[PDB]
Design a protein around this ligand. Sequence first.
Ligand SMILES: C[C@H]1CN(C[C@H](Cc2ccccc2)C(=O)NCC(=O)O)CC[C@@]1(C)c1cccc(O)c1
Lengths: 286, 65
Amino acid sequence: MVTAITIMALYSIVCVVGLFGNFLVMYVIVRYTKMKTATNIYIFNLALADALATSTLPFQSVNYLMGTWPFGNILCKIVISIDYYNMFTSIFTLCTMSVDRYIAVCHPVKALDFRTPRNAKIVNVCNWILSSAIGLPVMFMATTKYRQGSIDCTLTFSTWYWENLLKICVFIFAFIMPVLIITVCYGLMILRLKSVRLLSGSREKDRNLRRITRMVLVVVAVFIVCWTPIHIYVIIKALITIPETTFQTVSWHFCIALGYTNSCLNPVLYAFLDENFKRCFREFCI
Amino acid sequence: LSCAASGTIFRLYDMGWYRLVASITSGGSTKTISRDNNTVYLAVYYCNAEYRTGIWEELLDGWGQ
Ligand SMILES: C[C@H]1CN(C[C@H](Cc2ccccc2)C(=O)NCC(=O)O)CC[C@@]1(C)c1cccc(O)c1
């Protein structure tokens, strides 16, 4: 009742803002020649994944409102696969972004050869091909279960071995390891930046390098803050058999809502933190 | 004749005297200037110093009276 209406209202507000913002970012990268850079190819992949993530939220809101899933099997298999794709592609795109900024900051002589944009495009295709290994099995499994009370849309496992295994793999490969890679790359970059007078010879090049590096760090931090609580909740629920109570249902939905909310936040940071994006957005609007 | 520096500075980089008489790098490479990591000691001549206010900020220069 009240919870379903609240969810629908917030999801619709996160759906229109997110879809508009991430369409705008992609359009600007395509439209203006100056925008194309290795970092911009990586930012474009992030915003693709967030547009696909936000286009699903109306069906879920209707499902919560009506108590039943009326959209069929195939749309059930697409929505769930997209749910997993969001997590894997987003974490890997941030990881590759951080390694790219590491090569640029610490190995400039050899940074020049490997930072051509085509390399970034191949990197992004490889990221999607890798994420399919987790994504496609989830799509194949998902099903519409005809519960007597109402139709459900869920994942069918062959149960303890096959279900705890999926949750563990998601916790390890799509969370802990990329976070360690990112933390080590930023520790080494912070070491380089603290003790160098100039990073690229030219003063302007130095300032540009430090600005892009800070923007990428802020995006990474925001994503980690939005996604950590749902990840911990899944583990703490698996091992404890929490009793069912109002607090449990409300807290659970709130953590899922935060994780989805992150999809609309990034286009605003691009505009506040990048002069080129801010300029293109103003020129687009006017 | 010293060219001391004060204020909020994250890092101080190259210090010098300009009438280009002398340059002292932070390490101590010199182009008779001795610098202690916060002053350097060496026609009117003017103190020059390079600095960065923050880790992500841009290289600046400050002259003297
Ligand atoms: C991604 C996070 C949210 N989805 C919510 C999803 C949205 C939905 C889809 C169709 C109909 C209505 C709602 C859903 O309800 N999916 C049911 C299912 O497929 O079981 C769930 C898994 C989740 C908590 C999770 C977080 C972290 C790690 C992790 O492993 C899992």
